[PDB]
């Protein structure tokens, strides 16, 4: 006996614009096709459940979107508090309905937006709640959800404004399945998803399905209801026993919502285990200086939000003159401890401090394996740093970036020194976490801060064809690759080339391996956001963590075997037993234990794997490309992709019959390449 709450479109419209879909569509609403599409949903749903209705109200056209009325679990409901005032008037009417049906209604502070089941989706077996944030619901409402619904809350961050509500891109189904669109979530959230939902139960949809509101699906037992679906979608859904029923909802896609948004399940699974669990953390930091004009306070708030947290500025003390210092106290929230650590690390640089009564000693953990830091070690920066050891602030010596901080009691007192990972010795104490660390930067320091596309498609056609011919003929293809392959999205494609037999050897450096592994393990890549295509400023913690971890397992192959490396370029090399060489370099971090730092040997190893090669694929490696070039006799086809037109010309001394070159994006290249290779079967 399932009950859904809906609201008739008697006064439906697009009176205003508060999400991108509403753009332009003002007074473009056909009330009658709306009424008739709404009926289709209404009628289909009563064929499977009880439907209750809210009295429609003139002046609140979005009342039809009852998913945002609130969040219901058992006899408890958390009333939605809307961000935009265009919808705030719906709140008394939604409240009236809830209280008239016996529910205990909790109301958030009038400054914490939270927009209901539309932004917070129950696990259908009732194990936990998925709460969204990013656009409508504030992160800080999540611990109220857990408290009041007595359930475990998992925070997901929304990054694409098109999918401003969780239920427009995320959808828990029956018997543990999940219909979700991975690209609406940041790297931290995707990781959360994958670690709670086993791969066989995950149903990641394509962008095509997602812009038709496929995730905005009502699921009643084995029945799923939606607007439109590609048959590739219908195929997977039926493939595990889900019956798909469509029905046009186009007149509501124009206000920003579909099937799920028009409904609110008020009969929900109250369980057995559940109790309140929140992972959201909060910290008050203090910042002092010329806050308003240095843009210091403004850069701090940016780091917080961009890394995945939220802030509340609790108070501001304005200095009396331009040169007076000002002070600000700011409450920082993060969705987990790990993200809180990320945020505090960046803030420490800017000179944020604990309130002096919440000063605490830095946390220490012993080294146990030479050259390997304990887990969660703090990552040093270039800036002058103090650490707090038994109540005393101590100056870090030999300060350097991308190191750890080791603490010793010596005959001359406490010694804090910055050490690179490979210099650490079993028995040393190392700072972990982010307490008891501050920076002592001075004032002024802190207060400051050619190839055609069509030409390209030509080459790709040529390379692709000669590349399959060599594979069929049992030939030998070698790849040299740099980190730009990862940064530009090329990684997945190179993974695919190796997995399906096109690559008999891989030659590179430390960096390509670390970046490829970082990306597969954490969805990041130092210095680059590979989910939006521009550079980013931080990312060092993720980077050193990968280096420390592989060094702990002792090789990349043992990282794979132990299951911590499950995908990507280096993964595929190990899985298909493709030999790789990583030649060291003067700029190497770590290095990885696989990296050959004896360059005489590295040259001998490169030469050894170049024997018999029929083609060499050179993917944005410049230095390794030349090295490989010097070693390679004539009669070997050489393909050189780089964005710098200067290195592509530098690598084509073998005439237009042995060497072909293009000046573009190597990720672009590898996409075209992998597409044109598919057309060849």
Ligand X SMILES: NCCC[C@H](N)C(=O)O
Query: Residues 180 to 219: which contact other proteins by CB under 8 A?
Result: 207-209, 211-212
Decide if 135 contacts 164 (C-beta within 8 A).
yes
Q: Which of 275, 356, 411, 634 binds a copy of itself (CB under 8 A)?
A: 634
Q: How far apart are CA 410 and CA 600, in angstroms?
A: 41
Question: Shortest gap between Cβ of 401 and ligand NAD (angstroms)?
Answer: 12
Q: Does 631 bind ligand NAD (CB under 6 A)?
A: no
User: Has 165 been annotated as catalytic?
Assistant: yes
CB atoms within 10 A of CB 633: 8
**Which of 70/627 has CB closer to other proteins?**
627
* Coil/strand/helix, residue 324: coil
Decide if 54 contacts 93 (C-beta within 8 A).
yes
Phi, psi angles (nearest 5°) of residue 283: -145, 135
Question: Residue 511 annotated as binding?
Answer: yes
Q: Does 620 bind ligand NAD (CB under 6 A)?
A: yes
Question: Residue 622 annotated as binding?
Answer: yes
Torsion from C-alpha of 239, 244, 250, 253, nearest 10 degrees: -60
Q: Which of 113, 436, 584, 661 binds other proteins (CB under 8 A)?
A: 584
Q: Does 262 bind ligand NAD (CB under 6 A)?
A: no
Q: Which of 295, 383, 531, 654 binds other proteins (CB under 8 A)?
A: 383
CA 148 to chain centroid, in Å, comes to 29
Q: Does 318 bind a copy of itself (CB under 8 A)?
A: yes
**Bond before 137 cis per omega within 30 degrees:** no
Query: Residues 419 to 458: which contact a copy of itself by CB under 8 A?
Result: 422, 441, 444-445, 448-450, 452-456, 458
Phi, psi angles (nearest 5°) of residue 130: -90, 105
Decide if 296 contacts 314 (C-beta within 8 A).
no
Phi-psi region of 281 (alpha: psi -120 to 50; beta: other; left: phi over 0): beta
**Which of 96/453 has CB closer to ligand NAD?**
453
Partner from a copy of itself, ligand X, other proteins, none contacting 311, C-beta within 5 to 8 A by type: a copy of itself
Q: Does 70 bind ligand X (CB under 6 A)?
A: no
Q: Which of 488, 504, 519, 674 binds a copy of itself (CB under 8 A)?
A: 488
From residue 584, how far is each of 333, 421, 547, 603 by CA, in Å?
41, 16, 14, 10
**Which of 64/405 has CB closer to ligand X?**
64
Whose tokens are 């879909």? That residue is 21
Partner from ligand X, a copy of itself, other proteins, none contacting 83, C-beta within 5 to 8 A by type: a copy of itself
Q: How far apart are CA 672 and CA 450, in angstroms?
A: 18
What is the x/- site pattern for ligand X, positions 355-374, by CB under 6 A? Answer: --------------------
Instruction: Indicate the angle between helix axes 510-522 and 491-499, nearest 10 degrees.
Output: 100
Q: Does 668 bind a copy of itself (CB under 8 A)?
A: yes
Count the residues of the shown chain that bind a copy of itself, applying the rule CB under 8 A.
112
Phi-psi region of 265 (alpha: psi -120 to 50; beta: other; left: phi over 0): beta
Decide if 306 contacts 538 (C-beta within 8 A).
no
Partner from other proteins, a copy of itself, ligand NAD, none contacting 534, C-beta within 5 to 8 A by type: a copy of itself
Q: Which residue is nearest to ligand NAD (CB)?
A: 509
Query: In three state form, how does the secondary structure of 222-262 look?
Result: CEEEECCCCHHHHHHHHCCCCEEEECCCCCCCCCCCCCHHH
Count the residues of the shown chain that bind ligand NAD, applying the rule CB under 6 A.
25
Question: Shortest gap between Cβ of 453 and other proteins (angstroms)?
Answer: 3
Which neighbouring-strand residues pair with 278?
A: 153
Q: How far apart are CA 250 and CA 33, in angstroms?
A: 9
Residues that bind ligand NAD (CB under 6 A): 450, 482-484, 488, 509-511, 514, 585, 587-589, 591, 620-624, 642-644, 647, 665-666
Residues that bind ligand X (CB under 6 A): 18-19, 62, 65, 67-68, 87, 118, 165, 255-257, 261
Residues that bind other proteins (CB under 8 A): 23-24, 207-209, 211-212, 228-231, 233, 382-384, 399-402, 422, 441, 444-445, 448-454, 456, 509, 527, 537, 583-589, 597-600, 602-603, 606, 623-624, 626-627, 630, 644, 664-665, 668
**Active site residue ranges:** 165, 261
């Amino acid at each position: 006996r399932i009950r859904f709450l809906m609201c008739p479109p008697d006064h439906y419209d697009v009176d205003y614009v508060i999400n991108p879909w509403m753009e332009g569509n003002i007074h473009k609403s056909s009330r009658d096709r709306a009424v008739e599409q709404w009926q289709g949903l209404y009628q289909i749903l009563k064929e499977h459940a009880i439907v209750d209705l809210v009295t429609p109200q003139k002046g609140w056209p979005d009342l039809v979107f009852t998913a945002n009325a609130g969040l219901v679990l058992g006899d408890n409901v958390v009333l939605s508090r809307f961000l935009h005032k265009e919808r705030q008037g719906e709140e008394p009417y939604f409240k009236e309905w809830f209280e008239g049906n016996g529910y205990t209604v909790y109301e958030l502070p009038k400054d914490l937006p939270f927009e209901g089941a539309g932004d917070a989706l129950l696990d259908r077996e009732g194990r936990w709640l998925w709460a969204g944030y990013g656009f409508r619901s504030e992160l800080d409402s999540h611990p109220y959800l857990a408290k009041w619904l007595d359930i475990e809350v998992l925070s997901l961050r929304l990054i694409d404004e098109r999918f401003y509500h969780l239920d427009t891109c995320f959808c828990p189904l029956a018997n543990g399945y999940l219909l979700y669109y991975p690209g609406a979530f940041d790297s931290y959230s995707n990781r959360l998803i994958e670690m709670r939902v086993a791969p066989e139960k995950r149903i990641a949809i394509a962008e095509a399905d997602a812009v038709n509101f496929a995730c905005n699906t009502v699921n009643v037992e084995s029945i799923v209801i939606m607007n439109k679906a590609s048959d590739a979608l219908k195929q997977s859904l039926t493939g595990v026993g889900f019956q798909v029923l469509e029905t046009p909802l186009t007149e509501f896609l124009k206000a920003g919502g579909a099937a799920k948004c028009l409904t609110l399940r008020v009969t929900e699974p109250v369980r057995d285990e559940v109790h309140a669990n929140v992972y959201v953390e909060s910290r008050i930091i203090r910042i002092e200086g010329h806050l308003l004009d240095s843009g210091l306070i403004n850069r701090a708030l940016d780091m917080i939000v961009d890394t995945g947290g939220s802030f509340q500025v609790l108070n501001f003390n304005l200095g009396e003159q331009r040169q007076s210092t000002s002070a600000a106290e700011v409450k920082v929230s993060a969705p987990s401890h790990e993200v809180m650590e990320e945020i505090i690390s960046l803030l420490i640089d800017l000179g944020a401090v604990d309130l002096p009564q919440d000063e605490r000693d830095a946390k220490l953990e012993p080294v146990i394996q030479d050259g390997v830091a304990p887990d969660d070690f703090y990552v040093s920066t270039i800036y002058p740093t103090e650490v707090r050891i038994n109540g005393q602030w101590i100056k870090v010596e030999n300060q350097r970036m991308d190191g750890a901080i080791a603490i010793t009691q010596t005959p001359n007192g406490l010694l804090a020194q910055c050490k690179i990972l490979r210099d650490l010795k079993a028995g040393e104490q190392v700072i972990v976490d982010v307490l008891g660390i501050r920076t002592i930067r001075k004032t002024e320091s802190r207060e400051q801060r050619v190839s055609s596309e069509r030409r390209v498609e030509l080459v790709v056609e040529q390379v692709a064809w000669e590349l399959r011919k060599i594979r069929d003929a049992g030939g030998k293809v070698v790849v040299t690759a740099g980190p730009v392959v990862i940064h530009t999205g090329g990684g997945e494609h190179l993974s695919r080339l190796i997995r399906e037999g096109y690559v008999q050897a891989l030659l590179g450096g430390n960096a390509i391996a670390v970046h490829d592994i970082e990306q597969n393990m954490m969805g990041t890549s130092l210095g680059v956001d590979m989910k939006r295509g521009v550079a980013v400023r931080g990312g060092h913690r993720h980077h050193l963590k990968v280096i420390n971890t592989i060094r702990r397992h002792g090789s990349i192959a043992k990282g794979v075997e132990s299951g911590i490396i499950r995908s990507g370029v280096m993964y595929e090399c190990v899985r298909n037993q493709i030999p790789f060489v990583l030649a060291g370099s003067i700029r190497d971090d770590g290095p990885l234990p696989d990296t050959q730092m004896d360059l005489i040997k590295a040259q001998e190893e490169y030469a050894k794997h170049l024997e018999g090669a029929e083609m060499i694929l050179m993917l944005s490696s410049m230095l390794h490309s030349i090295g490989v070039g010097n070693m390679t006799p004539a009669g070997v086809k050489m393909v050189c992709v780089d964005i710098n037109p200067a290195v592509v010309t530098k690598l084509s001394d073998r005439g237009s019959i042995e060497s072909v070159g293009v000046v573009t994006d190597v990720g672009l290249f590898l996409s075209l390449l992998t597409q044109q290779l598919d057309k060849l079967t």
